Each structure stands twice: as C-alpha cells, then as structure tokens.
Ligand binder design. Structure first.
Ligand SMILES: CC(C)=CCSP(=O)(O)OP(=O)(O)O
Ligand SMILES: CC(C)=CCSP(=O)(O)OP(=O)(O)O
Ligand SMILES: CC(C)=CCSP(=O)(O)OP(=O)(O)O
Ligand SMILES: CC(C)=CCSP(=O)(O)OP(=O)(O)O
Lengths: 397, 398, 397, 398
C-alpha cells in the first residue's frame, strides 16, 4: 500500500514526523483511494505529504508532551485537518494545516508568523504555478511585528495565537495552495475596526487597482456588510475575521471574505445567503432551499463571500456549520438523507461505509469529534457542493 | 584574533563557506577593529556573519567552478560587498549581499526570488526589532512568477538576473537590515515604464495611505522626476531602478528611490542635489560645494538616492554615488585623503591609506582597480556630512 | 512513470541533486521495470534513491563545474554505477557509489572518510536489518587520521583518493548494503605490506575469534596468496587491494578479499579460479570452462574470494573483466553469444534491445564507456551468475 | 559577556536549544572565567558549544515535556555534565554529554546508538587531531544491532538505555574528545560475563597487537580484577562497567577500565589504590594518604578507573570517584575547602565557595543536594595530585 511503501523507503527524520505519519497517512491514502485517484497520484500526494507537510506540522501533541504551540484546527490541538469537496460526480481531497515554525508560541515567534511562508517558498520551487504575490500582499497588511505579536497573545486564547493558515487542494494531479489571514490580531493590537482593516487591505491590492469589476463587487459587499458588523473596534460577531486567497496569478485568484458569527437562525441564513435581498434569482433560491433542508436534517458559524477578478456581481456565499459535539454516527445518517434529498444516490449509498473505513480505530457511533465542519455552496456554473472537514488525528486516536 | 578564533571554534559545513571566510573574514574583522568596535562586538558580528551570512552567499566563484547564479554586486560575480559610513565622530561598518537560494539561476528560480526572504525570516526570529512588512509589500508589488522570471532572463544580462538585495548596518550593537528591490525585471516583462511602476508600488503602501507628510514628499519627488526620466518603457537614464526600505516598523522606515545615470557634470549634480532649484537653503548649498569638490578631486552608473521618512513632508538633498570601478585604488586613496583634508577630517586623512592597506593584506591594493567600487556622499541638517565607501571585498583578497 | 511522479512530488533541494536525477533516474526506473520489480517496488526504490542517495552523490561534475572530489567509479568522475546481477531465472539491480562528504577532497577530509558512514547511519535508522559492526571494525583497522590522509593523497592519483565505497543490493523488497575498504592508502602511509594489513585486520574480527571454520578457510586462502603477492610494502600487482563485507549480522556476512592485477592470461585465470590446484572438483571446472569461454567470446582485473562463517572450505572466486575502451555494441553481441552458450535463451533474446532502452540518449554501437565491468561467478548451490556494471552517467550523457 | 553576546549573534534554531543555553551557558562562561581562560578562548569554547553541542543535547526535559530518551548523566535526566580538573598550578574545564539522536529511545534507535558518532564525525572535520579509530573499534566490539538494542531496553532501567557517552576536555586552546562505552547492554543481551567481554574487546585492538608494554599492563590488571569481579554474567559489584578511550592517535590514547562498586571502606580504598599490594612505592603511598584523608573529610556507585597508555608496561594507581548525589552542596563545599587546606592548596581553599556560588547564580547552591555529582581524585608521579569535580549544571540552574 502506498503509505506503507513510502514509510519503508523514506523513514522519518524524527519521532514527531513518525507519529504524524502513523496517525494520519493511512487515512489520507484511504481518502485518496475512495475519491478514485490513480495509484500514481496516491504516490505523488503521499510522497509530497511526507517531504513537505510532515516537517511543517511540528510536534505531535500527546500525553506527556505538550507543545509550545496549540492549534485551533482540531480537538486535540493538532494543526491538521483533511477535507473532502463533494459534487454529484467527483470528490476532491484537501489538506488544511498551520505550518509550525520551530520557535512558535515562544517569545521569538508568539503567533507562528513564519512557518506558512517558509512552506510556501518550498512549494514555489516545487510547483511551476504557485504564486506568492497575494500571500505577500496580505502578510504585509495584516502581519505584526514581534512586540505586537506578544501583545496579541495576552488578548487571545492559546488556540487563537495565529495569523495565517494554509490549505492544499489535491486536484487535477496538482497541489493548489490557498491561504487565509486572520484580521483579529491586528484589530486587537491596533484598536482598529475589523471592517476597516479588512477593506483597507483589499483596496490596496494591485488587482483591485486594475479591475473595475472587482471594485464593483466589493462595493456591493461593503454596502451589505457595513450595517451588519461593528463600526467600532470590538470582536463582536458578526465580524470580518479572515481574508482568503489562492496562491496563483492574482488575476485568477478568488478573494474570500469570511464572516464569523455565533448566532444562526433561518432569518440570518436567508439574510447572508441572499445578501439581504440583493440576490433573488432562481439559482440563489435553490441554494437557499438546500441550506435550509441541510440545517433541518441536522465554534462559530462561517459565511464566506468569494469574489473573482472580472466579475462585477456577487454570488451566494459558502456557509460553514460547526459539527463539534454532535455524534458522528448521527451526522453520517443525516448526510446520507441529505444526499438522497439532493439526488446524489451513489454518494448516499457509500458515505457511511467509506467513513468507517477512513477511520478504522474509532467507532463513529460513539465519537463526537471526527466531523468538525460542513460547508455548503451552490455555484451558477458548477452546481451544488459540500465540503466535509475531518479531524484526522481524532479519528486515528 | 576573532576571525581566527571563530574558524577554529566553528569550522565550515562545506568548502564554499570555508572559501568565503578565507576571502572575507580577515578583512571584515580589520574593518570592525578600525571603526573601534569593541572586541565583544567583533565577536558578535563575526559570529553572526558565520552563522547567517556564509550559508546565504552560495558557491564561491573561482577558476574551474562557475556557479549557476552570477551577481552584479562585485567585479568577480561574488554576491558580497562591505561598506563603511564615515562621519566626523564615528565610522559604521555595513554588509551588502544577495542571499543566493540553492536553485538560483535555474528553471525553478531564474531570478533568485526566495533567498533574501529566507534570510530575513531567520533574522526576524534572531532580532527583536526586524519587521518584514515592507519587504513583503514590495515583494508583492515588484516580484514576478516563475514564467515571468524566465522571460526576464531572456532580456537581461546574467549579472542582472535579480530582483532583491540586502544590506546589514552593524550599528548600536545591533544588526539593522535594509533591502532594495529592482524595478527593471517587472518593467521589462510587463512593458511598463519604470517611473509608473515605482510610484504605483509606493502609493499602495499602508504607510502611504496613513501619512500625509510622506505623500507630500513623494508628490514633490514625482514632480521633479517625471520630466527627467523616461515616460516610455525604455531602460535609459536617468531611470528609477531601485526602491529601498529598512526592515523595521514601517512608520520609522526610510523609503529610498534610487536613480541610475551615466552622465554627471556640475550642472547635473546641482540639478539633482537641489531638486531643480526646489532646495535653495544654506545647508543644501554647503552640501553642494562639498559634492562639487569631491567630483573635481576624482564603468558603473552614477547613483542618486532620494530618501524619505514617514512624518517628514519636505524633501532633503539626495545621497550621490560616484562609481569607482576601473580607477586605480592607490589614486582613489590619494583623492580621498585630499577630500578628507578639505572637510577638515584630519584624523580620517592621516589614517586612510595605511588602514586601506591593512584591510586588504593578501593583495597589493595600490595595483588593483576593482577594490573601491562606489563612493556615496550626503549632507544632513541634523547629522552633518557623510561618506560611504563600498568595497569589493573578494577583489581585495583573491 | 514513477521517476517522473517522484520528481513532481519531491522536487530537489539543490541543482546538483536535480542534475543527478535527470541523468540517472529514468535509467534506474527502466532497469527496475526490465528486471520485473513491481510498481510498488519501483516507487520504493526510486523514493529511497531520491531521499538517501541523491544527497550522498555530491556535486554533478559537468563542463564549467569541477568538483573537489573526483571518483574512480566512472569515466566522467561521477561516484555512481548501476549494476545487474543476472541468473538463468532472475535479474537483480544494484547501486554502487561513494558517498561524498561536503569537504571531500580538501584539507579537512582528503580521502572522503566520513560520507559512507554517515549514509550507513541513516540506513540503520531506516532499515531494521542493517548492522554497522563490520563496517566499524574495518574502518578502525584501515582508516587513517587527517595527516595520514594528506600523505596518502600525495602518493595516489586523484581518482584513487578514497578508502571506502558502498553498494546497495535491491533484492527481496529490501535494500541490502555492502561496503568495500581499500588497503592501499594504509599500506602506502605506514609502509606495511598489503598482505599483512589485510590479514591482520581480518584476524582481529570478533567473528574470526568465534568461528573455527572461517579461520580454516582464511589459512587456506593465506597459503594460496602468500607466494603470489608481495611480501614487501610495494603496490605491485597482484595485490590484496580491497576487503568487502555485508552490513548485516557478522555471523551471516560474507567476507570478501579482492585481488587486483593488470595481467590476466589463461594460466593466471586457471591459477586464480582453482586456487592453484586446490579446487579440482567438477563444479569448479565447469565454472572455469564458462570463464574461459567468456574471455574467448570478448583498469585492473579483479579476483574476489568470498568466505562465510561456518564454512571451512574455499569456493572459486568471482573474476572481474574491465570493459572500458571496448565498443558497447560489440560487448552486447558478445554477451548475447555467451548467453546462448549458457542456454540462457531468454536473456540472449532480450539483452541488446533492453540495453538500448536503458540508455536511449546514446548509440551503443558508437560508445565505449557504458559497460565498465563484467563479473562472473559459479556457486555450488546457486549456479552460474553474471554481474554487469554500467556507467549510468556515461549512458545518459 | 561572551555567553550573552553569542546568544544575540547566533540565536537558536529551536526552543530546546534556547532552553539549554538559558540553563547552562552562563554557568559555563563562569567556569571558563574562573579557570583563567582568556576572553578569546571563552568565545572559542562557547561558540563551539553553541554550534556543536546544543543540537546534540536533544530536547530539554522540563515539566510538561517528557523526552523519549532519559539520560543517567544528571539527576533530572538531562544528558550533560560540566567538570573541572584542579591541580596546584591550573584548572581545566571539561564537558560530558550523550549526543542524542532524533529517534533515540524509540524503536528505530532504542539505545541511542548513533548520535555520539555523528558528533564525532563533525568534530573530525573541525579539529585536525581528532581520530575515530578507537571509537570505531569499540563500537564494533560492544555495540548492538537493533533487535539486541530492543532486548536490552527490557532488562535495564530507562536511565541506562545507553552504550556510549562523550567528554570534551577544553585544554591547550583545543577540544580533546574522549568516549566511554558501557559493557552492560552487551553483557545482558549475550549473557556474557562483563569481565570477559571487556577484555575480549581490548585484546582485539590494533594497538594491543603492536604494543607489548600495553599488553603487560593489561595482563597485570586482569590478574588483579579476575578474583574481585564476577566470573558469572551478573551485574554485581565490583564490576567492569565502562571502557574509555581518547579520540586521538591510538598510540597516544589512554585506555581506561572503570569499575563501579557500592562498598568502599579504608581497606578497599587501599586494595584498589595499591592493586592489592602490587604498588608499594612512596608516590603510591602518598596518594593513598590523600585519598584516605578525602574519604574521612566527606546514591551512585563509587568508581575506580585504571588508565593505561601504549608504551607504558607498569600500572599506576587508579583515579577514585566519590559519589556526592544526595549530600548537601554547602557541606560538600566546606569539606572540599578543608581538603584543599590539607593539600596546601591555599588559593583553591580560599576561593572555592564564593566561586561555587557565582557558577550557579540562579539557584541557591547551599540548599541543593544534586549539584555536585562526583568527585575524582588521582596522584601521578610526573604530574602531582589532582581533583575532578563534576557538576549537574542543569540542577544548578533550574
Ligand atoms: C478555514 C476553513 C475552516 C474554511 C475555508 S473555506 P475553503 O477554502 O476550505 O473552501 P473552498 O476550498 O474554497 O471550496
Ligand atoms: C546596494 C547599493 C549599491 C546602494 C544602497 S544605498 P545604502 O543603503 O548602502 O546607503 P545608506 O545605508 O542608506 O547610507
Ligand atoms: C567494487 C566492484 C567493482 C565489485 C565488488 S564485487 P560485488 O559486491 O559487486 O559482487 P556481489 O554483489 O557480491 O555478487
Ligand atoms: C563519564 C564519567 C562519570 C567518568 C569519566 S572519567 P574522566 O574522563 O571524566 O576523567 P579524566 O578526564 O580522564 O581525568
């Protein structure tokens, strides 16, 4: 099996990397098999994961060994998630991580400011299509000096001592990086409103200055958000908490503005999904039925407005439902029912057996931590989609 | 001696680092001694150099071993310079380099786009006051993807396959990084005028949006440069070829706009120094006599560097850089002694030649023409006159 | 293809490693395909080669870039060879290299004394069955301090500034290391006879002291060699120039004593093969016919006497014929004829097309450097074998 | 100060190295100052420590972070000791460590079999006089394959999962390595008596075969030890538990055979020191009074170390090591002052307590019982009396 072959061939530089492999790689290889990646792509991705991702993941938190840096990405504080993006026809595997520098969570690096850019630099000599210009732009806008980072750690819980995180889409035989920047540490430290920081950083992008359509989309977005998020410097949800970009040509990159809120009823779902009455068309409304049916059939909620250069009109967001604390057997039964509702008969018939087989060390009918998030979207061109985000480590124990 | 002691204590991870040390570290230790750094600071800076700078310098170009990446920083293609900044009261040592990545000058990294940021990342965990925000800003504005980098190499000579370089001021017991970004590769690849892209990148700075004084200074600078540099996309002089920042809090960083030109007579020196008649005050005019006297007392382009700081609205006179490559180093030393006497820097005059000899003991500096590379001169209202001398250390040692 | 997939997944830490891959890995993957290794084993070996062997190979000598260390292993000074061991039924791929330290061929490391042990140390945490005790034993016996190493470089050509080299058999899904130690630098520097050094080092082995059979074999070997090699300190072939061991349990390791000579006529072949009349049995004589037929159908010659603990009697040696300077098209036609002589019809029918396909950048009917060595052996239990050693780099240009 | 200056210049690759430095480097710099090393040598040894020793020390065991490998070298499981060797005329500083590989104490490396040789390889390219031949010889004789290593861990406590450790004498402006190999894991796994395997490994040395004097010394040693240590495979005292060599030319290396025992009265001290009546001369007998006086003036085993050199046929008296773990460090200091007065080392007596305090400023050394770990004493005919004091640096700093 590819994960086993690579272990045999490569070994491990240190014990932390060995443990990360022993607790994630079998699962990943299972995911890639189940999403119908060829064997050559299984090897591609697993070898990549070994060489580039294992060293970025830092120490493997476990009984008796408490890392200086604790991630918010998972229940046990491990900076890793594996996610699937499901259509009608295909499923795509993705990794989400924080790349942990070797002084992270200590005075020389209080918010783990460097690990993600170091990974991306390695990715840029590895991969011909990786572009760091949007990364560098937002790092310059929302990054903090060391003194500022220290101040931020006094005002945030241990699981939120971070500015950046990274995802890698394993798609089209390639690795496609995306990054997300948190606005919160900068908001806190400079006592600037999150709304102003977020849009100030966006409006200084080189692509913003060249693309009139993007400027039109953002002004619509701004007009929707301005009345709904704080005008002052509080961290009072609903709030503009992350900015997302693809690490590709800035003209092709999607710009992502993520709201976080703890409150989500039907009125709020409607309001977010339709941008307050702005989107009334039949595609948007079909999406909204889907989201409402999902809520019925079933950490902050997330609303992610994604914009692309050359497009003047906003689309409906992706909405993220937190699943931490809900039984994983129930979630699986709920998703099967939702998949039948969508007419995704093949996804419905396989979901629960393939979930078991991803996570053989665990009884999903007893766990509550393995599904962490679910995102749903509807695109005008691409159709409906579902993202399921798993705490791999929780599922491997 | 410190450079010897660190060799014995540290050794070398590879032969290229050993050769770098053997061709630069004696000289550097000499310079620090001559600028009256304490012994503890000599160790501090030499140990730092060994740990952080040696691995960043790449292969040591020499007969039989042609690196894939050739730097424009020195005559022999070595990515290193050492410079001294001389006042009346003190002398400061500084290093200039390019941090060479391990695939530099090959298809995976045609313009050496990553080494400098990697060095700076290491400097940020080392040093409590290092800030990368201006670095990242300009890297986003003037940097290029791989395909663009490959295009750029087809339009530039081998010595100009670069976007960034780094300097380290060894001052106040600290290491203070500065970086410089070339506008040329982006100008060439996007077929944009250098003036436009330089100012477009500056005007998108976070500090530009917060600081009215800086905007005002740049607006005056723009009015002066717009008529004097190309409005088209040519690389002809005078041109806006580099943008410089300090890797510190953006509010305290100096923003530097560097012109390169090959033509420099007395009228041009006047025009640059006074910003075309804009500066007429007595401090400016004293600076101008000094610079005129230097030009009289004495290939690469001339440089003119306008340096602007947040919170200051008015432009100051630039620093002017005289190129010295190809002029005998014994002559340059005699000229500098005379200039130092003119300034009333009697102590600097009396020591300059003997210290020059002692900086470069393994080569007869009176026979060479490549060791002094540049000379910069400035006058500040608050600081007084200054001189920067930039040496091709490797040419002084091989 | 696996070599391509790994390139894509892994990239390269530096340009030298990239060039080594671009000039050897396609060939290796071709060899492994032709010897019928499964795809999973192709990935195993190619991933291993990338992680462990590429960094050990040092700079890639090429026009404009002259390394400080020049290896004798190949025509262009590259420290690599790939070899095949051919039976009737199977073919085994092996790598031979010198692991180049980062100060090799300079004053801090004049004979490249450290790179091979550093590779083996990495192999010992990678592989459960690797044993370093025989390595360390012979390193202690024939290794030299820095001053001695400097003296040795003044008395040897640049291509002989070495004490150790390494081979890796790619067999049974495993990597099996072997090492060879040169007696010459120590002989030269201490003005000790090679015969005395070689046997002194052997007789101080822990296994020699425990195994009466081995002591009996070596005393027979000593009685054969003593009259035929110098009693003085000259490097006058025939001479005892290398000692070989397997990096496994000392009780299972074969101990190999290699003679080098520039003179090889029928009388000498006979004398070496039969240990001077000592071996007269029908197995030995069939071997000898085979070797004689090979010579007829077609750097020093090599004679390698291999002994194993628990066996009191000597076996016939392996004899190594240097092929440098003989046309590679001719060698292929000669080997095809020899394979027919042996009744290895399948090996005969495939040898020349598979040779072409290993080395697609080159016209074998014009080159003289690609076959470097041929070894032949006959074992009482295992049967006849042939080892062919290729200059991979010469074959890739 | 040098330890501060190197921190500022070098920083740390990871937090474990930072913590090591923060808990040992001040103390080390203190020791070097107190032994009258020049400032240049302080830098030399501190820079060396940073580059070569910090990464070899592994994780820094502390509350909340339990490393996979736990060393027996110190009370807190930290693989480091600092020791001073005191004469009448000088004091020499030495480091003892285990070089912790990155899979140590796990299935891929159960007895930490590789870190020490990796450090020594780095030392061989650093230092012109380092020689690995004796290291490799004993590693071949007493080392174990992985399966054997896993068996050994089932028969030994966690603090004894080791085969090798390393010491570095900081002497003559140089670093001189020594290594020690434990015979215990091989004794246990092969069910061989410790006496037999110790001498079997020694007798296969290349130098043993060339040097009649060394063979004669060992033959006398064997006659003395054979009746006193087990003839069976038990780990009971007295036992031959370590073999020591210098990593230098085998002809100049001292070969050290160390006994460990828990029982030490005046008759036993006499028996060990005189090799059972074998040594009766006036130098030996003066040494013996000294050692008797030390025992009177004052848990781990006692150590007795017989040290033999090629070209010497006759045995000398051993060095005897008194274990001090569990005895108050204020008391030990008062005892040593008294012993120093007895020796007529008035200067050593007058400074010992104040320097002890200043070596360990972040802990009150009068309250601790773990800081002095061992005391060794020797007498040479050619060299005079000596004392080695071994400190648990980490226990003195945390
Ligand atoms: C960081 C979290 C929990 C979600 C980010 S939204 P995403 O990038 O995972 O979703 P897409 O890949 O854009 O479909
Ligand atoms: C890199 C070159 C040739 C010139 C840079 S100007 P500088 O930064 O060296 O001069 P100052 O340090 O600003 O005085
Ligand atoms: C070093 C050279 C050219 C030959 C060594 S003999 P070998 O080990 O390659 O042959 P075997 O693998 O023992 O059949
Ligand atoms: C490692 C331990 C506890 C004792 C070793 S004896 P030593 O080598 O430290 O003493 P000397 O350096 O030989 O004086």
């Amino acid at each position: 099996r590819p994960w086993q072959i690579l272990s045999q061939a490569l070994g491990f530089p240190n014990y932390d990397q060995e443990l990360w492999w022993q607790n994630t790689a079998e699962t990943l290889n299972r995911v890639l098999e189940q999403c119908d990646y060829s064997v050559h792509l299984q090897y591609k991705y697993l070898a990549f994961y070994h060489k580039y991702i294992l060293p970025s993941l830092g120490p493997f938190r476990r009984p008796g060994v408490e890392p200086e840096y604790i991630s918010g990405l998972s229940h046990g504080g491990h900076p890793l998630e594996i996610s699937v993006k499901i259509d009608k026809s295909k499923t795509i595997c993705r990794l989400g991580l924080q790349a942990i520098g070797p002084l992270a969570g200590t005075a020389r690096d209080p918010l783990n400011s460097f690990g993600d850019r170091e990974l991306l630099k390695n990715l840029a000599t590895l991969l011909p299509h990786v572009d760091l210009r949007l990364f560098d732009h937002f790092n310059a806008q929302v990054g903090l000096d060391r003194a500022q980072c220290a101040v931020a750690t006094t005002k945030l819980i241990k699981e939120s001592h971070n500015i950046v995180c990274t995802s890698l889409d394993l798609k089209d035989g390639e690795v496609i990086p995306k990054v997300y920047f948190s606005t919160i540490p900068k908001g806190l430290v400079t006592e600037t409103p999150l709304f102003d920081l977020t849009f100030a950083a966006i409006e200084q992008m080189e692509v913003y200055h060249k693309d009139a359509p993007l400027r039109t989309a953002l002004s619509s977005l701004k007009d929707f958000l301005r009345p709904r998020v704080p005008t002052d410097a509080s961290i009072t949800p609903p709030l503009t908490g992350l900015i997302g970009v693809d690490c590709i040509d800035p003209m092709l990159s999607r710009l992502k503005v993520y709201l976080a809120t703890f409150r989500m009823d039907l009125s709020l779902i409607r309001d977010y999904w339709t941008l307050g009455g702005l989107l009334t068309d039949a595609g948007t409304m079909k999406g909204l039925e889907m989201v409402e049916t999902l809520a019925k059939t079933l950490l902050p909620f997330g609303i992610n407005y994604a914009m692309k250069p050359g497009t003047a009109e906003l689309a409906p967001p992706q909405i993220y439902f937190p699943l931490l604390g809900i039984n994983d057997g129930f979630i699986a039964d709920a998703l099967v029912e939702f998949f039948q509702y969508m007419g995704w008969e093949d996804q419905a018939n396989r979901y629960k057996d393939e979930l078991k087989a991803k996570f053989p060390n665990v009884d999903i009918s007893q766990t509550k931590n393995v599904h962490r998030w679910l995102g749903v979207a509807y695109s005008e061109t691409k159709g409906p989609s579902m993202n399921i985000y798993y705490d791999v480590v929780a599922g491997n124990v």
